[PDB]
Structure formats: C-alpha cells, structure tokens
Specification:
It comes from Mus musculus. The modification Phosphoserine is found at residue 11. The chain has helices at 6-15, 24-30, 49-55, 65-74, 96-102, 107-114. It has 123 residues and is mainly alpha-helical. It starts with 5 loop residues before the first helix and ends in a 9-residue tail after the last helix.
C-alpha cells in the first residue's frame, strides 16, 4: 500500500471510497515525486487521476475528491492538478474544470475553484 500505480489508483478513485487513500503522502515524500507525474497520468493524452475521478460519480457524489485535492496541495508542483491539462491534439488544453462543468453539476465547480485554479484556461 506504499508504492502506488496509475491503474490501481484509478480503480481506487473510481469506487468513490476514500479509506484506502492512506499512503499517497507517504509515497510522495518517500520517492520525492508529485501526483502530477507521468507515472500516474495517461502517457498518450495526459489524463490524470482527477479526470477519471470526476468522469464517474455516484448520483453526483464522489467523496475521494476532497482527500485527493487536500493531499495534492499538501505535496505537489505549483500546479496542483487543477491547471495540468491534456496534450493530445484531439483534446489539447482540456482541463479538469471543463470536464466537471460538463456533467451539469455545480458542487464540483465549487471545490475546484475554491482550492485554486485558472478559470481562464482554455482548450
């Protein structure tokens, strides 16, 4: 439960259960890496864990988002996966804020903007 991989982290966030997220901070402070690294994001497009987390919601609730964002800001590159955007020509610049706004929800927008972001970021 210390060494984390993209696939298992994506499965963890997908279920919306935040109990097994104990270990992200320990790994990030042990291997000296952030959560915005290529090791956790898609290598073809640039999709990150926040993206998969917000693409799946249980009737509009995903409790893992709060622990994920707080741990991200607790340790991360000056962009806490809120300005890190896709790179594929199909979806260049596509960030988490647009994806959150897509599903026709508002709370996710509240949290994403509150923790800080670049609302002017464009795709």
């Amino acid at each position: 439960p210390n060494r984390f991989d993209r696939d298992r982290l994506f499965s963890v966030v997908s279920r919306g259960v935040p109990e097994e997220l104990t270990g992200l901070l320990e790994y990030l402070r042990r291997t000296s890496k952030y959560l915005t690294d290529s090791a956790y994001t898609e290598g073809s497009t640039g999709k990150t864990c926040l993206m998969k987390a917000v693409l799946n919601l249980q009737d509009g609730v995903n409790a893992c988002i709060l622990p994920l964002l707080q741990i991200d800001r607790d340790s991360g590159n000056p962009q806490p996966l809120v300005n890190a955007q896709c790179t594929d020509e199909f979806y260049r610049g596509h960030s988490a804020l647009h994806i959150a706004i897509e599903k026709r929800s508002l709370w996710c927008v509240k949290l994403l903007v509150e923790n800080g972001a670049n609302v002017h970021i464009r795709a």
